[PDB]
Every structure is written in C-alpha cells, then in structure tokens.
Amino acid sequence: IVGGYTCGANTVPYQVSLNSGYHFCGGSLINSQWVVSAAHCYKSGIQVRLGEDNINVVEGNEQFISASKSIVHPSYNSNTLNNDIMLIKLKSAASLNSRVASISLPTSCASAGTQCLISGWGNTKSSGTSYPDVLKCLKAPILSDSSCKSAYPGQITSNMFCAGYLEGGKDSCQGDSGGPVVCSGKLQGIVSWGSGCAQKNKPGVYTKVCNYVSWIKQTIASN
Template sequence: MMTNQFTCTLLLLIATASSIYASDDRSYVVLVKGKDGGVICGGALYNNRTVITAATCLTFYDVDQLVVGIVSSGQDINIDNNGHTFNIAFDPDTQENDVAILRLAEPVSATYVKLPSKQPVTGSTGVLTIWSANKTLVDISETIITADDCVSGKYNYEDGDLFDSMLCGLSKDQACAIAGSPLVSEGQLIGLASWGYGCANKANPEVYTNIYEEKSWITSTVESW
C-alpha cells in the first residue's frame, strides 16, 4: 500500500523559507527543516510555542538536527529540549495516527489554528496550503469525500487502506503536498497531509490525518507541557 506514498514529497525537499512571507491569514504555516535548510515537512502553529505536524516527520529523522521555519517571518526557531513527541499509536506501515507535536524553544507571534469542533462533513471544503517547488505558499481547495468513496475502486485506494484516523480530500488542482501540510477550514485544522499515491489531483485523493480523531491526544499532550 505504502510503496508510492512519498512520491510527491520527494519533489519538494529542497527549499528554504528565508525569502517567502505568508499573509496574515495563513501565518500559522510552518516548515519543519533540517539545519542545512532542506525542507522535510509542513506543520501548523497551534499556539505561540506549539506546532502540530505529522509523526512521519519525527520518526525517520534525528530531531536534534531539525528546526522550525516560521514562514511569516522567515525565522528558524529551535525545538525545545525534549519538546517533541508523536502519538504512541502511530503505525509507520499503515500511517494510522500520523500526528506529532513540537514545542518551540521560544514563542512566536502569528495567527494560530484551532482544533476542529466536529468531524469534517462529507462535501465540506478546506484549504490545503503547500510549499511549492518554487519556494512559495500555494493554497489548494480540497473537498472531503467519504472513506467508502475513497476506496470504492474509482481511485488508487482499496479496502484496508484507510482507518478512522484518516480522511480523504479531493481537489480539482494538482497538489504535491509534503507530509504535515495543514488542511484548514474556518480557522480550524481539520487535517494534515499524510500520504497518497503521487501528487493529488481530481482523480487521486490526498489522504490526511483526521485531526478531530486526534484532538484528545493533542489537547492532553499540550496541557501536560
């Protein structure tokens, strides 16, 4: 199932945030980067010290060698000592519970996302913000489709591919999203780009971490810090 999940991710690994600034309404967007400047994942600011991103972004990298790029200011912020964790239920084979938390070494000023107040409704839309190959932020409109539709045979997914911690989004535009890229609706973080087969488009849904399903874990983790 997972053979091609990082195809689109690999297209976007070489980038820096030093010269690009987000507009105020999406200054929550961050980039998880290596200290050499290479972009690894996306993420979203939950408060002035907390980033929500994908567990994938931590499990395969040495976190001590990572920083968080604040796209709205161009700053690179260190991750606090021991200020990183991912959901212990994360399964790297299936991508279940693909969510992680980073605590910044210093506070930042930006807009912040809220956690979703309800499950995303089928047919509702959100905005996926991705870091493009030409080092700009690009907004892609995504429409939530049901898991049954996603694995119906119309697309590349099949029974057993999707779990409760996931949701599918379909776009008319091509979206090559790195893991952790935020899907936001009305200021609420409803999803994080997790995996998929190649770049998403109108015939190929993106699979997201369903943040509503991860809400209690995120809340309890942040409160414990």
C-alpha cells in the first residue's frame, strides 16, 4: 500500500497473509474454511496465516493453517487478468473471534464513489521498494467505468473495476495482490493489477467480486 496508514493490530480481522516460506499475497477469510484471493497469486505449498499484524513476529493472535485445495477460477486468463479470482480451502477450520473473522460476500455490486478499505503488506513506495512488517490500510473510492476504461484502453472487462485517485500518490501495490477491497462491509474487490503503483492516471484495477458470488457459493457447497 502506497500513501496509506498503519491499520492497527487485528483491526482488519478478515485479512490473511498467504505464505510459501515468505508472505507473497493477501487474501480474505469468507468463512471458517475458505479464503478468497487472486488467481495470479496461485502457487503450490500455500499456508494461510490468519490474525496477523506483524508478519515477522509471533504476537499471539495468529492461526497458521495449510491449504488443502486451491481452485483458480475456471475462466481465469493470465494474459488479460480476466476472472482474477481463486478459492483456497483450509485443512482445518479457523477459530473465529473478534480478531479473526469472515467478511461478507456482496449481494449487489458497490456504488462508484463509495469509499472502500484496501489493505495489505505490499510495497509502500511508488519508486523504489520498502515492504512493511505490519498491515497497511488505504481508503479509496470506486471510479466510474468510463474513467477506468480511459485509463487502460482495451484492457478493462466487465469483471474489473478501478479504485483510487487519478492524481496518483495513493494505491495498492506489489504484495497487496489477492487482498481485500471492502465497501459498506462487503468484499467487493480483490487487489488485481495496475500500471506501477500510485502513478498519475493509472489507478488500481480490482476483480469485481459481485460477478463471482454464484461460483463461490457453488464451489464452497461442493468442496
């Protein structure tokens, strides 16, 4: 997260770190057994880390649970990033508390202009690299489809939306991928892609979760 703030320990209780020996992506806990992330975050050997604040220090609220199954969306196209969503099933159920909690799936797509909370452990610089140990947060509005399409001509599908600030300076970034965009207490986006981070006229692009709710429900009901 570039231009954001320190969330505070366990103030984003659905945020997960995906770990393959190191943090590599975020995700969102959606029930005690399932995590939503980005398909471009796929790899084998995932351990889901719940109740994290500092990802390098055991602070006492962590639950480390290996993935039993990863399911990339059937129509994920890594060339275009269309359908950039995956589900991760945990080997055992998380113990839900005030600091480890699920986030609700949307019923309707979020409104443009709604201020959303985006979070993660990704790069905090738009030039150069600096990765935080504690969770960072950003508040950013959903942009209109016309501004999104203008920013990225020929690249925005109906399964994507833009959020952020056209002036630059505030954005998600590398390492935030797969993490949540929460608007009105619903998981409306997944950190997906963008052209660098926090660049003028290049807002963040996010997987439109509302388009996937039927698939998520069907998949969870059968796995």
